[PDB]
Amino acid sequence: MISNAKIARINELAAKAKAGVITEEEKAEQQKLRQEYLKGFRSSMKNTLKSV
Numbered sequence: 001m002i003s004n005a006k007i008a009r010i011n012e013l014a015a016k017a018k019a020g021v022i023t024e025e026e027k028a029e030q031q032k033l034r035q036e037y038l039k040g041f042r043s044s045m046k047n048t049l050k051s052v
Contacts (some may be wrong), residue, residue: 002040006033 013030016022022030 001044002033002036006036009033010037 010030010033012025013033015020016026017030
């Protein structure tokens with residue numbers, strides 16, 4: 001899972017997106033973060049799989 005600071009940024013940009021004020025630079029930033037989030041998630045799922 002990615003840093004707490006980055007989760008906070010994802011939430012901030014998600015809010016801008018819903019409000020329709022997000023810029024193109026922020027959209028690109030959000031995409032990069034969403035990829036970093038999914039990567040940290042797949043990694044975490046690797047050790048969550050090891051359970052009954």
